[PDB]
Amino acid sequence: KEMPQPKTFGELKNLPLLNTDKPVQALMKIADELGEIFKFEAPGRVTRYLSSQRLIKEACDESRFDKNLSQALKFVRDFAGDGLLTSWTHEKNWKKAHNILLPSFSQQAMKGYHAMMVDIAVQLVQKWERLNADEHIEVPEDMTRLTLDTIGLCGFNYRFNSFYRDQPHPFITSMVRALDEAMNKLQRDDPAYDENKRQFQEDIKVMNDLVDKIIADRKSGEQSDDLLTHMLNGKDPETGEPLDDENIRYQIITFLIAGHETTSGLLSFALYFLVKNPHVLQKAAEEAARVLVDPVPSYKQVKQLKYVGMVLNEALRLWPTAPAFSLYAKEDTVLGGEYPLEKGDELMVLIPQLHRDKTIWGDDVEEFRPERFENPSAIPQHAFKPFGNGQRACIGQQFALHEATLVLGMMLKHFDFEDHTNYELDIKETLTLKPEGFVVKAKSKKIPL
Amino acid sequence: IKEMPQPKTFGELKNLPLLNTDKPVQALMKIADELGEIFKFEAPGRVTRYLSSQRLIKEACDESRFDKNLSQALKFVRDFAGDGLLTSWTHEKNWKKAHNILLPSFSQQAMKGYHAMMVDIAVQLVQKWERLNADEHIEVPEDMTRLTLDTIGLCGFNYRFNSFYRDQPHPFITSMVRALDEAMNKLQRADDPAYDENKRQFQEDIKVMNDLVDKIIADRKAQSDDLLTHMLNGKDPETGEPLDDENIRYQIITFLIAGHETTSGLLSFALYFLVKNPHVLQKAAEEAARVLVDPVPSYKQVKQLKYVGMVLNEALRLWPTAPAFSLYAKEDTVLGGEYPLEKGDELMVLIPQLHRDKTIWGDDVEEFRPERFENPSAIPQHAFKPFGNGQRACIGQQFALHEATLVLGMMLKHFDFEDHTNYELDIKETLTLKPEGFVVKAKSKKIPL
Ligand code: HEM
Ligand code: HEM
Ligand SMILES: O=C(CCCCCn1ccnc1)N[C@@H](Cc1ccccc1)C(=O)O
Ligand SMILES: O=C(CCCCCn1ccnc1)N[C@@H](Cc1ccccc1)C(=O)O
Ligand SMILES: C=Cc1ccccc1
Ligand SMILES: C=Cc1ccccc1
Ligand SMILES: C=Cc1ccccc1
Ligand SMILES: C=Cc1ccccc1
């Protein structure tokens, strides 16, 4: 009944606890001490952090709780607008865009995106085959090059050409800088931040201008197998209305934000766990070698990379790269039979803690064991939520998994990998998670493309 | 590409008389020793191929290319098991329905609720052995069948077969074992030479089985947390429908068939290998004593019997008590790059031969070494298949291992064992395998319950 709460800082309450450069990891350690639920207070804010499957299975009841915009999502809303990620469920553009865009994200739609994903994956492989001896790979940097180009090409037929660059593209310099200012507002109205505010607005213009220009450019009349084409021609069956031009821009910005970082973190964590668990890497490499029998993987071959998928899911279990989502109570209700909640009360789902629920997973929760995911139907309901929940779950889940399976499968086919530094896991936190400074050496197996 | 070997033939009867033997699996293993990883086996009206190498079976386990087939054995068991989970085709609507409804009651989390009833039966077996007089011996498979049959009755539908109060088995299982015996006999009949007595007996055997079950279902409908309760109150999330009363009785018969025989064979082979390998017995007894520190084991203590679990996995490697399953090709495909298969072509997986693949386990394949299973990541994919494959794998796997671990643990804690007759392994073959005539002496350690 009485809810635990971590240490306070006077009038700032719990907020200075987030004034740290690893806040998710700080929140995990608080859950380790306090258990399945703790109250987290800030000036003007009250929420509760959930960590057990028993409580989260209830928070996930869509009849009782809806998606809430966390403070992080409200700041991203300043440039993602009413895109799909940062809109409320009752907002008319959510359901409209949801109905128009769901078909472009089905497993059936990945048959059309596959060729462009292979385009960028081949560039990654060729980059690595062209390294000189004893040169190394900066893994998260190269996975980010791959994911951003993949979504740019598949989403709106745009080539960021990240593998031709050292300093990232100007659009993503401002975009990453906007996301960086959003996270900083969390752990902060002084005049010293006025520079950041003026810089934030100029970053929004850089983003809107490039995107709004592409929308105007295409509207040429050309038709391509990309999200942008479906967004100019699609009509919501419900209202019979197409998305208006402002909403298309928000979706494009949204897909770029939601696209690259979460997926590049997954690939980066997957490769870290492979080089730290050589038996698992051997099993994944044997699968890649025997399934990917052509110089260019096909869509069907990728679907046969079952163990590669298990590696991906277990990497998502330990470090889900979009590590929380937020909910509010639609009506007065009782949580777990012990925590009465009022209408509008907020919950945070701490995904990495959920995924360490010993009562669900047994006691070896910290060990990387893809064999946990041999039979996916066996996993209890709402114990594994890397892609969120319900109708507000990740619309790009199939896209992200198909890209990551394809790319990891090709990496494992084409190179042997060496953890030549004995890399010490160091998780850098933005709004997403990635293993900072992770480096490897790749020895080519000299298989042609 | 490669011409497939085939064992000796008998004119128009082809290979079928090779199965007219009282140890057909063992005969099939010796054929595999002579012919290798794959051989064609022909019968009047039937063609199948027996696989014995991990290299071919890892492709056969690809669910996009092969689905579960009903062997001739399972087609005959279907005459009284109906469309229960074990003898239904994957495309049958009652398979997926019953599968979705019954998975939560077979989860590792559900074993916490069965545990008390499992201990109930384990204590009965322990007390039987401590009440033996000096120089009396234990009939091991007989007592393990008493235990597993009572555990599935109690945990499954709150019915007490009271096997430890009986000399002659329960009337329901008299026909149940006699129906299984007729099913196996139909396999090895070179027929219709006035077999009507067997036919008339088969029908009366079915009637005994349905009547007892149909009454238990009728009795209950006029709450106990058992499989029967979940089956009356469970609704499939997909179709939203519950199981009908006909299918419920097929499931009950199926669990009684599939429950006890395979699991009692496992405990029996496990104890045989333990008394034939005294260092392994000692090591498992030492684990039992330091883990089982209470007079009654808890669910958590059973999960800590790690070496006992490896002992069970190693007995399952040498003598998997459900020794084959059947698959069919969903589409034309090539097996191993050298054996073209047409859509609908059948495969048999000879599990005990698979588990003797020297390229997987080394050259000492015949030695009992539980340490092979310290890390599941070290085992190549699909090398170890005692519970079948994929979505048609054994649903009762966690039930069987928890029961067998609890019971073996209590056995090792409470008694020292003597292989007083220097027992010579003699494997009796039904549809399952057991060590016939296996007897031991147990000297009590005098630790109270
Ligand atoms: C290119 C890949 C991806 C795209 C295009 C994408 C896009 C999106 C979009 C549009 C939403 C909002 C959906 C809605 O509310 O209607 C969303 C939600 C979400 N996504 Fe993704 N996503 C991608 C990859 C990923 C990855 C790899 C992960 C995690 C490992 C992830 C985790 C999530 C989560 C947890 C949510 C729910 C957030 C919340 O409830 O507030 N996404 N995604
Ligand atoms: C109380 C214990 C057990 C129960 C309740 C049980 C039940 C079942 C059921 C219902 C199925 C069919 C699943 C489906 O197709 O949806 C099945 C399959 C299977 N079981 Fe079990 N079982 C038990 C113990 C065992 C043991 C101890 C073994 C072997 C050591 C075993 C080996 C197998 C195999 C090999 C299959 C797949 C058969 C095939 O593919 O044709 N089971 N079991
Ligand atoms: O916990 C989090 C982390 C969630 C980040 C997820 C953003 N994402 C998801 C998918 N792609 C991006 N955010 C809280 C922190 C906070 C709590 C109380 C008071 C102020 C801030 C919030 O924003 O409310
Ligand atoms: O190989 C086997 C042994 C497998 C029995 C499995 C029994 N079990 C499995 C799970 N629970 C019970 N059975 C073949 C024999 C046969 C082959 C060719 C032609 C005729 C007969 C079959 O009947 O299909
Ligand atoms: C007597 C042992 C035996 C071994 C293999 C096949 C049939 C019988
Ligand atoms: C939806 C059909 C189906 C296919 C395979 C397994 C279970 C159900
Ligand atoms: C050995 C099987 C058995 C089962 C119940 C009672 C007596 C014997
Ligand atoms: C340690 C024994 C072993 C077990 C399985 C695969 C390789 C080695």
Tokens at A54, concatenated: 């028993």
β-bridge mates for residue B196, sequence order = none
Distance between CA A107 and CA A162 in Å, rounded? Answer: 27
- Provide the 8-state DSSP code for A16: G
Distance between CA B68 and CA B329 in Å, rounded? Answer: 9
Tokens at A215, concatenated: 């929308």
β-bridge mates for residue A40, sequence order = A47
Place of tokens 């290319």: B65
* Nearest chain A residue (CA) to B102: A378
Within 13 Å and on the Cβ side, how many CA atoms surround A96? 19
Distance between CA A424 and CA A319 in Å, rounded? Answer: 15
The H or E element containing residue A397 is: helix A397-414
Tell me the H-state helices in B162-305.
171-187, 196-221, 227-233, 245-276, 278-291, 299-303
Catalytic: A200? no
- Which of B32, B44, B45 lies closest to B6, judged by CA? B32
Place of tokens 């998305």: A243
Place of tokens 């993949």: A150
Place of tokens 């939560």: B104
For residue A364, give the amino acid letter: D
Write the CA distances from A335 to A3, A51, A144, A341, integer angstroms.
12, 13, 39, 7
Distance between CA A253 and CA A310 in Å, rounded? Answer: 30
User: Which one of B103, B108, B381 has the shortest CB-CB distance to A283?
Assistant: B381
User: Which one of A283, A369, A378 has the shortest CB-CB distance to B380?
Assistant: A283
Given a contact cutoff of 8 angstroms between Cβ atoms, the answer to whether B55 and B37 are in contact is yes
Write the CA distances from A30 to A22, A27, B266, integer angstroms.
13, 5, 45
Distance between CA B62 and CA B55 in Å, rounded? Answer: 12
Active-site hit among A40, A75, A384, A387: A387
Given a contact cutoff of 8 angstroms between Cβ atoms, the answer to whether A231 and A101 are in contact is yes
- Provide the 8-state DSSP code for A243: P
| Closest residue by CA, ligand 2 atom 2 | B259
Residues 242-281 of A with CB under 8 A from B: 277, 279-280
How many angstroms separate the most distant Cα atoms in chain A? 64
How many angstroms separate the most distant Cα atoms in chain B? 66
Judged by DSSP in three states, A330 sits in coil
Tokens at A297, concatenated: 């993987």
Tokens at A204, concatenated: 């929004």
- Which of B70, B246, B260, B87 lies closest to B176, judged by CA? B260
Given a contact cutoff of 8 angstroms between Cβ atoms, the answer to whether B130 and B414 are in contact is yes
Tokens at B268, concatenated: 């029996």
Query: Looking at the annotation, which residues of B are catalytic?
Result: 262, 387, 394
Tell me the H-state helices in A339-395.
351-354, 358-361
- Exposed, middle or buried by CB within 10 Å (0-12, 13-18, 19+), for B222? exposed
Tokens at B166, concatenated: 């009986």
**Alpha carbon A157 to its chain's center:** 21
**Interface check B376 vs A, CB under 8 A:** yes
Distance between CA B153 and CA B161 in Å, rounded? Answer: 7
Domain boundaries, chain B: 1-449
Our CA angle for A100, A107, A356, nearest 5°, is: 105
- Provide the 8-state DSSP code for B355: T
How far, in Å, is the centroid of ligand 8 from the Cα of B170? 43
**Interface check B239 vs A, CB under 8 A:** no
Given a contact cutoff of 8 angstroms between Cβ atoms, the answer to whether B147 and B407 are in contact is yes
**Interface check B64 vs A, CB under 8 A:** yes
For residue B236, give the amino acid letter: D
Given a contact cutoff of 8 angstroms between Cβ atoms, the answer to whether A281 and A419 are in contact is no
